[PDB]
Symmetry: D2
Subunit: 297 residues, 4 copies
């Protein structure tokens, strides 16, 4: 009987212009997502360079997301994690206070908590707010893995925790998850394997590619949720080349490059330690892009 | 292309007093046939191919071919080697013993390059006129057949029709079928049978089906009939046993399970394989309690 | 280049009632000074830098700086972040607080490219005029500072004088010192302190030294004098404790050990870090009985 | 225990017209002897053991044994298998041909358990009365001989005297020699020859010494004499070639290098091994130019 946020979702890039958050660009990109069938937007996740934004920039992009999605069906699943439990709790309350429909909370990075620590970490977050909480497992970035058992325990013990965004290249784990707890919302955080995760009972994606091709990712997800597996697989197969090229360098360097190449943002700006891609990868992204039809504003 | 697909079983090789129990072997193959299996794989990894003599190799292929006569069930004989000259000989020998096709594992230990793997399989494919299925299991061989190499071999050689993937890498299975949708992707990883079938895979070469042939058969055929809800339901249902059968290196758990179920008479391996630990014995037994194990 | 080398300790940060036990911190540092340690590292990974406020970062740097005045012991302050603008600020801040140098961990989580890491560390190095030691620990950060990037930063930037390696990769430590023998390679992995020192490493930033500073100090200085025999013998003796201190994620075992001794009064962590399991707890307690633990 | 240690070479096996070039094999061996090598390893991994017939196996051991008679140089014959019965046969086979000891690789592909590895090697060790060196190369075999199993085999079996480690794991080499300092740890990884020797290792089984036997010999001897400064410098000098010799799977680069230097007449392999890419060919040739290569 849990409240959930599922479907086609986009981990929004955060455009910079002259080192500032391009707030009008942010709103325009979100409207573009809404107009192409996206079900929810994820402000200031990994793809939004959450690590290099200030807390005010944090609030500004959640507020823009919440405003722009008002009066539409599109929900706002705000990035609000940290590797310090006390800060993650504050960011959760902060996100709720700004009107987010739920929070995406990344597993603590760098300090490698144990499974017991991860349980108490997320339990403290879940008890702090009364909006849905989606776990976020990306061990290649955090250095830790939320075990299947820990995810299931958190799902069963805490009311707001309703699923997990898996970015782990481990379809075995997604079988494990849904075989032992079929009530949870398994969310793909790995564009290349969107369809295999959905076809096994996953209920959504939090996509990088959808920044560039929101119509294609949304269509894929809705095909799969409607059990039209043949058409969902067909879009997944078509998207493989771009899905992979968007990680030739660390996300979000390629996707922001692609967004700039398509004319969707005004300046290829990052905040250090992130930076422009290599010129060979610049050309690689530009070539893979030309084979896809990119909607405008 | 001529193909061999569907639900397939990597047959264990039972031993009695250190020798191949040929009657048990035939009885086990008949059990597979009667539970809906589409093909059997003699002397694969699960069949302890490494420790059988060539002569035992022939004996197990012949029993498989003889036991499948008068049925639709094909024999996809294990016939690989990390020496190309030997792999060619095993392919030709498998064909001469009546196999319908060969499963040919990527060279283990000596780590050929992608160029070497191409020439290896091309020499095998040109040696026979029966279907050849590639077999990628990097955790055992120390090498990986890249997507590009698999696709090139599929396109350049008439007998090569697909690959048995045992790599825990669903991304690669998207890669394979997205760029070459005509190939037969075969799952060599029981736990992810359904995700591979759901992405367009056309069969399984199963370990679990030694113990639960009816469930693996039903899973595969549901998926091939695009009844994905029913295939997933068996896959989720099989997860516990699918994993426990790898608590020690295959085929140590599956032979242990077969012995616990009374399907083979003696828990015998050939060294360097051996009985499992007493705790893993108990674990296999416990996981087994939740499943319905067909007899003979 | 100005350098900070020798036997160094990544200081734990004791908590009492959820606050930094300031008295305890100073007393622990004094214990380190009195047992031959050459530098202390406040608020590194072992110091739970991730869960301390900027206020608390300052407090432990200030305590470290004041406690080492009038001694030969240097303060190499932890001052890294995965945001370059913040890493520059923390570097400047550490400087103003009287730190002798900074340890700056590779950006975690956001996985910068080698180009990004170069610009990141170049911005830090140009922000201060005190030595900067790079810190590569890919198991925690998700990224690796390549040998090429480390060498470029060492050669291009004045203050960058070496790297604290915690990567379990002795090949990389050969690579580093073979192509740039002027850099200070620092072991960030206690179990392999001696192999790194014997290949030209010039110090350690130790976890074990929290509990056994005299033994790590002796190991390092034996090695720096090319008394390899004595350095290896201490390294071999410490292997058991060096490993058990990572049965769970550092600093959970070392803080447990410090509590099991008489050195901190409360086994407190800041979530998501927490007390170890009970079996690891007895496990740390059993191994400790083998070593002689200095008091205050 | 009887031991075979010092500077040792994993001999390449030259082929000419698809056959073992027996006169070249002998010329190369003599070359090794004349440049200070202490033992030669016929038909190991670098000798393409996987693609030689058993008669060619016998031929290359016999040539090694005959060429080393009347010298100090020992012959440590490759004689491993992933089937214990065959590995036992190959061990007895090597002893009857006059080998001084055997190198026996851990079973590849079929991934035996630690218990299985113990029984595998115990059967081999009890089969012969000549020294047995274990060989751990998990990147190629798919398995790993644990420290505990290595130590158990060393303590339980008289002729098992050490291990040739090719695992890029200096922590394990500390673990091994800290808990069992009497065993002979042998480097199977040229780039980290010095770190392994400096920790108490007593020899190397080298790929690089095929091309530069004098340099590997001096390195090893300097180290055995505790002249670590001279051993480390040679190790640092050799790093580039040590790494480039694995741009592609060994022995593809070393045979390419041997051919480029004129030490072998034909760049021939047995499939699935083959010529390197022309990019990597050029790279091997460039790296070579910095080293002084001895002739015959
Ligand atoms: Mg730091
Ligand atoms: Mg650490």
């Amino acid at each position: 009987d849990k409240n959930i946020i599922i479907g086609a979702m986009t981990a929004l890039i955060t455009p910079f212009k002259n080192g500032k958050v391009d707030e009008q660009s942010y709103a325009r990109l979100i409207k573009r997502q809404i107009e192409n069938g996206i079900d929810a937007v994820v402000p200031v996740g990994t793809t939004g360079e959450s690590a290099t934004l200030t807390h005010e920039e944090h609030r500004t992009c959640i507020e823009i997301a919440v405003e722009t999605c008002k009066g539409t069906k599109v929900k706002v699943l705000a990035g609000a994690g940290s590797n310090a439990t006390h800060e993650a709790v504050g960011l959760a309350k902060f996100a709720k206070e700004h009107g987010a429909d739920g929070i995406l909370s990344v597993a603590p990075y760098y300090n490698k908590p144990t499974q017991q620590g991860l349980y108490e970490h997320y339990k403290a977050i879940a008890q702090s707010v009364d909006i849905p909480v989606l776990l976020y497992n990306v061990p290649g970035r955090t250095g830790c893995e939320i075990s299947t058992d820990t995810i299931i325990k958190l799902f069963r013990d805490c009311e707001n925790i309703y699923g997990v965004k898996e970015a782990s290249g481990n379809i075995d784990k997604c079988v494990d998850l849904l075989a032992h707890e079929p009530r949870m919302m398994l969310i793909s955080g790995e564009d290349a394997i969107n369809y295999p995760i959905l076809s096994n009972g996953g209920k959504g994606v939090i996509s990088v590619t959808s920044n560039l091709l929101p119509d294609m990712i949304s269509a894929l997800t809705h095909f799969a949720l409607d059990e039209n597996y043949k058409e969902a697989k067909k879009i997944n197969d078509e998207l493989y080349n771009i899905n992979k090229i968007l990680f030739c360098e660390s996300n979000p360097i390629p996707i922001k490059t692609a967004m700039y190449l398509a004319g969707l943002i005004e300046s290829l700006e990052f905040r250090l330690p992130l930076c422009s891609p290599s010129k060979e990868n610049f050309a690689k992204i530009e070539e893979v892009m030309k084979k896809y039809k990119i909607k405008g504003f």
